[PDB]
Amino acid sequence: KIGKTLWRYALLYRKLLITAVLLLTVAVGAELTGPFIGKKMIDDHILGIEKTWYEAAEKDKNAVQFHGVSYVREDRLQEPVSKAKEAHIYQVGMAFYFVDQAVSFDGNRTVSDGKLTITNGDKSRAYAAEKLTKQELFQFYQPEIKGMVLLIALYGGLLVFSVFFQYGQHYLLQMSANRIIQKMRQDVFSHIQKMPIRYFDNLPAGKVVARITNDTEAIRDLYVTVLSTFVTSGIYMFGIFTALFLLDVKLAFVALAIVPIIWLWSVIYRRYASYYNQKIRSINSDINAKMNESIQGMTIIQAFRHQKETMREFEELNESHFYFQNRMLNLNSLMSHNLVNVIRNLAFVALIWHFGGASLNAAGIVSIGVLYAFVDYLNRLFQPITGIVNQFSKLELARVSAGRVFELLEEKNTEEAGEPAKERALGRVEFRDVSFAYQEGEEVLKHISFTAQKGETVALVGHTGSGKSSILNLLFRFYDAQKGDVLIDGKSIYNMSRQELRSHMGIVLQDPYLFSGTIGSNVSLDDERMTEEEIKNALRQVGAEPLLKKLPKGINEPVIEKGSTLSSGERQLISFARALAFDPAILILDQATAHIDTETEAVIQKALDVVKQGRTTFVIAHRLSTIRNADQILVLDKGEIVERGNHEELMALEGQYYQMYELQ
Amino acid sequence: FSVLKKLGWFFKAYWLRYTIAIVLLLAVNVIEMFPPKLLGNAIDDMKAGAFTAEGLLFYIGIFFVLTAAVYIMSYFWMHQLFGGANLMEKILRTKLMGHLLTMSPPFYEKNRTGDLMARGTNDLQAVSLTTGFGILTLVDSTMFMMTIFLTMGFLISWKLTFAAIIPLPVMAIAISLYGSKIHERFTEAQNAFGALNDRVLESVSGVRVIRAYVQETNDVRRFNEMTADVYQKNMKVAFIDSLFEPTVKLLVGASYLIGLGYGAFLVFRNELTLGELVSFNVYLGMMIWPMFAIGELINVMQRGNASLDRVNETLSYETDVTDPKQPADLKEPGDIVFSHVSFTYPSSTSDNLQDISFTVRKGQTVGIAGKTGSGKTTIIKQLLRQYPPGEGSITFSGVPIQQIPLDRLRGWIGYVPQDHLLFSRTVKENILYGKQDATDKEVQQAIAEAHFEKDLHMLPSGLETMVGEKGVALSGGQKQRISIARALMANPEILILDQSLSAVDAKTEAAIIKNIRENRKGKTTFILTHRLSAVEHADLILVMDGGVIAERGTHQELLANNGWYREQYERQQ
Ligand SMILES: CCOc1ccc(-c2nc3ccc(-c4nc5ccc(N6CCN(C)CC6)cc5[nH]4)cc3[nH]2)cc1
């Protein structure tokens, strides 16, 4: 399946992924420690005054002076005196009131007539208290300052370690993704090179290139999604809930309600947004298609005045686009960020309710630090929810692209083999009962059989032009082992390796594709062995076909366009040059139908007079000069054989030569 | 900010939507300041002894009310703004298409199809992004940021506020810097990926050559491996992308830590409470998004200004030279005078001048012969009034060509171009393209006159069969016949055929020409074929060479004097 193969490629480079996850985990732990440090700083130091105090002799440094009386805190005690003037510093509104006497029990504190009255339910009890001045409160807050430049230092110290590891994990997840995609692109291209011509002849080049390049970018986005959005946030959320359960289990089990919420919202968003975004993408493609059809066919519209109806169709598509886009806007409004803000405010509600209930009875004294920690953690929790949800909605297109690639990778009937080039063939080609049905139903070749001689085999002609011709170029090597047999020098074509067949053949297409790079690179194709020999053959090329342009005075001219950058004739010159460079042992030239028959073709004719010096130069003799200058001629009757003879065809069937003279 | 001055027509037309949206947006940006301060007040009340369940119910109810208000108002401003954005995209698609429809070949000769189709996709999306998300980031960067700042200052503390906010502008400028560098390196890697795509397309298209000369597992594998190692230099992008999150985390964590520490020092000095400190950490979480939004607004408005300039360069900076300002004419009896007319396209500075002197009358079939590239199509292109008018004059039965109503004029001409282009529709709809009224029996007679109907009922799955966009059962002659049938279904006063007959041999096409000339019954017809068979039946024939009339007259005078006519008549057969 799709996910199985993605896991297969990801288990490769497992060291980088495991390193990334570990660095991530450390960074997450470090980053999430900070709010727990804030909890410590709140509940211990800033709320330590709320904790009980004792009176002891001023021997320890922890003890703090209060109007000449030294009071030491319970948590900070060394057990010198128990129940020795127990004291409470309760808070009445914005005024911390000192209660020297041992407070019996907490409650709703109120200050009346310079006396503190504490009420708990029905019962109430009063004590004497004195309002503290700013200085006194600060002095009592002094036995914490010393311990607050460790908590702060820890927060600072665990925030500059997390940062480096966070950089590390993001880089490693990236590196792992791009390396996996590198391996995937290399594997796909190697499998392309093994695959047959039939796959290319079915669909255009665009689908192939999309599978190699564009779909692999989609898979890169998938891997970065899964790793940086799902896995990262998953580990983050796990650590967050770990901390929340270490803080308050009862409230954390409320906070876990967000996970079913995310499940529900991401499921609904998928279910609807897949439909809406599919329709938007389809309609946008339809709109761009309408614009391209219009611009290409504007003159025809103007001629017949179809512009009003065309604009009506365009506005129909555009208004449907606007409808679906507005519906998706409604969904995203109700269910992307506004919902996050809702969840955030409701979380604050749950906090206020729970901690208010704590502020009732006597469980709300040390808990406000937990409130701060929850408030800090939940913002970290609700941030990536939108990213998770949107990427979950977007995963389906990436799974589609990945499946389209793994269809290509999992294809069978590959042409894998070696390339023996041990000896040069003589070129005694022959055929016996050769019948090849490319369309399985339709027979394209009907028992063709002819014996080419040892060189000077120039016998090829289409069925009066544009009939059953070019497929014979495909007959030898691209399609094989259907029926009949074909031999070269007394040995079978099918038994030999296909690269061994191609090791000595050389073909000029009807549309020679000029490769990128230099003209020397376009000819030699950057062959490693043929570096200096490319220049040695370039001497022969300039001697035979001189550089009339000669823009850089060498072979450094970069090829700019795919074909006919300089002239249509130069394309053929480069093609014949590439043919003569590799091997003149066997070669099949183009049909030259597309060419205009300018004077430059005469130079190509001279190149033919060079190129026919080689061994067994097949030529689809469409041109009159190619017909007359042929050593032998073989016109085919729809894959069958009319006859053989340069003059015998002229004698018997005068209409063929006359028709080719009329056409050419 | 400049682009918002340019789109004043859009905001003036839709002032109500944007006014309502900005009102709700400022209202909810004010209302978001209340939940954290209420939480802080609740903490301070809990710490205080006066806490009661009535306070709990009050804070809970107020939170629910503010929550629902923020959700509802959020939905409505999102709907209004982003509906305005999608609506601007609709309007600009409509404007661009209405411009392209009312624009002649010259504009396409200058501006390639790729650029115009790019304007319809990227530039409109950028402009719509500015009217939507751009306005939003302008609001959230200025008003939300300053509201957060002023609330943190007044309602909590000014010392804390100015201490804690010091790293956030550093975050803002760092985000702008990293965003710029990511854009540069992503452009570089995208260029590398484009190179990879070009090389793979070259290998795929030239796969026969890569197989023929044995470079299957030798050279193209090395090229794809090396270029994939170059596309692996998106690690240079990752080095900058991976500083985006940790820089933010570092600065924000420092801001939280400043807030915590200084708040814990101010609570010691009795300048703050715990709840105000907690509310500060909440507002610090609110404040992060604006500091991103500043950089995103800069990028968005710059890209939108560029896109709007690019759109208006076509829309506002182009106008067709075609203005029937005062039509006072009626359907003319084919006495069309070209006594002198001369012009060029912009492809030369009046050097390769086409320079013609001719006249025709109703029923005068005007065959036009010549070699390739020799002006034959150019004269009818001038008759079609696609380009601005040449020197001299073309006159229709007394009135010049320029004064004729353009719609009526272009409706007189039933024109079959050399490129039989189909619209990727059904054959019936392609034929009714000419006569866009409701279908009747005339379409069957019209396609029967084309002579392709005998093949159309059987071979291409009947009439209702998709053709175009690679269609089904394609053929150039069949497309030519469908084009001729389209022209016939238009029922033109003036028929023009440019090389449509050349696809099929002269044996059927000559009979088709004869049947057309029989059916028209004296309507004007122009024939432009490289062959001379159809031309032979023309009552008037002319031969052009180099954009100049070599000879003109009947077929007999050409066969006597013009050697090119007899020689080409003999060469084809
Ligand atoms: C053709 C159009 O196409 C669109 C293009 C972009 C977006 C779009 N992409 C976005 C990414 C993030 C945000 C966004 N992220 C936010 C984080 C916090 C906040 N708050 C909450 C609420 N208040 C009001 C402001 C601060 C708002 C936020 N808004 C909005 C976005 N809007 C929508 C439509």
Ligand SMILES: CCOc1ccc(-c2nc3ccc(-c4nc5ccc(N6CCN(C)CC6)cc5[nH]4)cc3[nH]2)cc1
């Ligand atoms: C520890 C403290 O807690 C944290 C709080 C917030 C973040 C945080 N880190 C972020 C990194 C990036 C973004 C963010 N990335 C964006 C990418 C694109 C865009 N827009 C949306 C769409 N439009 C069209 C283009 C620009 C906004 C974006 N906003 C938000 C971020 N929020 C990190 C820690």
Ligand SMILES: Nc1ncnc2c1ncn2[C@@H]1O[C@H](COP(=O)(O)OP(=O)(O)OP(=O)(O)O)[C@@H](O)[C@H]1O
């Ligand atoms: N992808 C394909 N699958 C099956 N058959 C194909 C395919 N491509 C071409 N052919 C065969 O090609 C035959 C004839 O046309 P071909 O493509 O050989 O060019 P042609 O018309 O002979 O022109 P040329 O003069 O250039 O050779 C058809 O019978 C057709 O079946």
Ligand SMILES: Nc1ncnc2c1ncn2[C@@H]1O[C@H](COP(=O)(O)OP(=O)(O)OP(=O)(O)O)[C@@H](O)[C@H]1O
């Ligand atoms: N739309 C155009 N824009 C620019 N130049 C043009 C345009 N149409 C024609 N030309 C110029 O005129 C040449 C072709 O002229 P024209 O089409 O009159 O020749 P033709 O022999 O009538 O062609 P055909 O008879 O095959 O249609 C072009 O190669 C070019 O130089």
